[PDB]
A paper describes a structure:
KDM4 (JMJD2) is a conserved iron (II)-dependent jumonji-domain demethylase subfamily that is essential during development. Vertebrate KDM4A–C proteins contain a conserved double tudor domain (DTD) and a potential zinc-finger domain at the carboxy terminus. From our biochemical and structural profiling, we find KDM4A, KDM4B and KDM4C DTDs display different histone-binding preferences. We show that these DTDs use an aromatic cage as a general mechanism to coordinate trimethyl lysine and, most importantly, the sequence specificity is largely determined by side-chain interactions with surrounding residues.
In dramatic contrast to KDM4A-DTD and KDM4C-DTD, KDM4B-DTD only displayed striking specificity for H3K23me3 (Kd=10.3 μM), with no significant binding to H3K4me3. As KDM4B-DTD also interacts with H3K23me3 with high discrimination, we investigated whether KDM4B-DTD engages H3K23me3 using intermolecular interactions similar to KDM4A-DTD. Indeed, KDM4B-DTD binds H3K23me3 with sensitivity to PTM states on H3K23 and neighbouring residues in a similar fashion to that observed for KDM4A-DTD, suggesting that the interaction network with H3K23me3 is shared between KDM4A-DTD and KDM4B-DTD. Analysis of the KDM4B-DTD structure reveals a highly similar overall tertiary structure when compared with KDM4A-DTD and KDM4C-DTD. Indeed, the KDM4B-H3K23me3 model displayed a similar interaction network as KDM4A-H3K23me3, including the hydrogen bonds with H3T22 and H3R26. To pinpoint the residues that account for the poor H3K4me3 affinity of KDM4B, we looked for apparent clashes or missing molecular interactions in the modelled KDM4B-H3K4me3 structure. We first noticed that N960 in KDM4B-DTD showed a significant steric clash with H3A1 and H3R2 in the model. Indeed, with the N960A variant, H3K4me3 binding was rescued to Kd=303 μM, whereas the corresponding substitutions in KDM4A (N940A) dramatically decreased H3K4me3 binding, most probably due to disrupting the hydrogen bond with H3T3. S965 in KDM4B might also contribute to the poor affinity for H3K4me3, probably due to the lack of strong ionic interaction between H3R2 and S965; such ionic interaction is fulfilled between KDM4A-D945 and H3R2. Similar models of KDM4C-DTD with H3K4me3 and H3K23me3 suggests general conserved interactions as with KDM4A-DTD, except for the H3R26 clash in KDM4C-H3K23me3 model, which might explain KDM4C's lower affinity to H3K23me3. Together, these results suggest that despite overall sequence and structure homology, specific differences of key residues result in unique H3K23me3 specificity of KDM4B-DTD.
Residue numbers in the entry:
A (entry chain B), B (entry chain A): 918 to 1026
């Protein structure tokens, strides 16, 4: 429930705790996929799945075999593992300083 | 009091009303500029100003002549009028389509 203009406390650019204001917010949904190489990715944007229109239908079955477009520009096969949505925020200290801070790093009243 | 993930209603580009999800939010600085033909704009972002790096030094002096980049991609002279902060939100319909919306255009539950 963190909102625009809300005053929170988070770590500085110096690594110290100060009150700052929330001036931005974003929701990012990322997929975890397992390649055959034994490798994986966890910052796969949903639109990159080409064997299923996840933007509309939502994420595949856990363990589902999928095809995706990779940072390659090319298409590969993989196993969909998990889906995770994260909240990220932009804060502004009394500094004038700004930083991009993860929801988990923010203390609120 | 609008939050990431919250389901709201707004007009899509069809001009009709649909449920959408808030996936973004920003506290956005908007410049008002006055064109020579007598027209205005009030949703001009600070980076659009070409005759000064407003992202760092802040807004130009009031009434100041500025060169800006417009929605057609070309550069024009304009008269900086005032500066304003507005809450804007990024929403996503079940389409998968998205829209950038002012807080005032949003109906909430």
């Amino acid at each position: 429930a963190v909102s625009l203009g809300q005053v929170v406390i988070t770590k500085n650019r110096n690594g110290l705790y100060y009150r700052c204001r929330v001036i931005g917010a974003a929701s990012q949904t990322c997929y975890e996929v397992n390649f055959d190489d034994g490798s994986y990715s966890d910052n796969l944007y949903p639109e990159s799945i080409t064997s299923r229109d996840c933007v509309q239908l939502g994420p595949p079955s856990e363990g589902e075999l999928v095809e995706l477009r990779w940072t390659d520009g090319n298409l590969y096969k993989a196993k969909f593992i998990s889906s995770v949505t994260s909240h990220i925020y932009q804060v502004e200290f009394e500094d004038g300083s700004q930083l991009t801070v993860k929801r988990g790093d923010i203390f609120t009243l």
